[PDB]
A paper describes a structure:
Avapritinib is the only potent and selective inhibitor approved for the treatment of D842V-mutant gastrointestinal stromal tumors (GIST), the most common primary mutation of the platelet-derived growth factor receptor α (PDGFRA). Against this background, we solve the crystal structures of avapritinib in complex with wild-type and mutant PDGFRA and stem cell factor receptor (KIT), which provide evidence and understanding of inhibitor binding and lead to the identification of a sub-pocket (Gα-pocket). Furthermore, we report the identification of a sub-pocket (Gα-pocket) located in the N-lobe of the kinase domain, which is surrounded by amino acids of key regulatory elements such as the Gly-rich loop and the αC-helix.
In total, we obtained protein crystals suitable for structure determination which resulted in a total of 12 crystal structures: two apo-crystal structures and ten complex structures of KIT-wt, -T670I, and PDGFRA-T674I bound to avapritinib and to different ligands synthesized in our laboratory. Similar results were also obtained for apo-PDGFRA-wt and -T674I, showing that the water molecule is located near the gatekeeper in the case of the PDGFRA-wt structure but not in the PDGFRA-T674I structure.
Numbering used by the authors: 553 to 566, 573 to 693, 776 to 785, 790 to 973
Amino acid sequence: PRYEIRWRVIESISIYVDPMQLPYDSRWEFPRDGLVLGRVLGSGAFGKVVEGTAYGLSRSQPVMKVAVKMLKPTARSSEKQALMSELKIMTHLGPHLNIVNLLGACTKSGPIYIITEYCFYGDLVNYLHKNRDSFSEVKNLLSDDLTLLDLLSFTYQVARGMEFLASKNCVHRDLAARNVLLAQGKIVKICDFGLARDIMHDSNYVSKGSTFLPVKWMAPESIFDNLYTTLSDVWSYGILLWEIFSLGGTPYPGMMVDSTFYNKIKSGYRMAKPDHATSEVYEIMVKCWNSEPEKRPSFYHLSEIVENLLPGQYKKSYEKIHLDFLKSD
């Protein structure tokens, strides 16, 4: 077992892109001297993510806080290769406002560093736990100045980030609130934060076969048939929405994951409406949990549905932030 990003890019359908055969664009190379490493953000079985300060990484932000992914110093050569593969996948996908973007890398001599965007508020689970008891207000949704509109904002941005990944034929395969970070301005950023975890000793991951999988977040066809698609990501999106509107509850609370659980879900059991979900939001969840994958809504359609649940002025505010992101270099 080794660390590996869970994302997979579809090459063709009758086939996944082999990230080892992708090129590494040396334009991402950043001098190690320009990085000052700081405190740990998360530490897992194979490596860690740490805060850092990057000097001259951005012409517009010559001193910038970043996050840095790295392996333990004992990492085998096959483990380093997987970090290269993650680097190549991020280069291949390109940037979007609602993913944790690649900013640079140190690959030339010594340990491999992946330099990514830093997300001030951390992961969505901890953010919801911090602000659970608190549950120009509309204008302050997308700023640093909890309400139902905050939850709907998170819901919308994850759909836009996921719509982007799907447009690149990328399947996440571990979409969950622990893999959604919140950056400055309450901007949602989807990622794979697995480097910060030990899935062999994590109650969110369950021994199945020769590995540990996020079964409570997985569509039936992924559990039984090992089939992962953008439509199985949609199922996980519905489970993620349950996390959000339960303000950080664990899915299927009090239920143990075992053979009984798999067949129960397969037989049609679904989670009840979380306490702070509206009827419109719960109907979205129910649609995402269709047994037939092709009955599940696309992320493009999900973005359209959720946008219509938000104030009109929210959409303009989002596109101003999105415009700033596209113009910034």
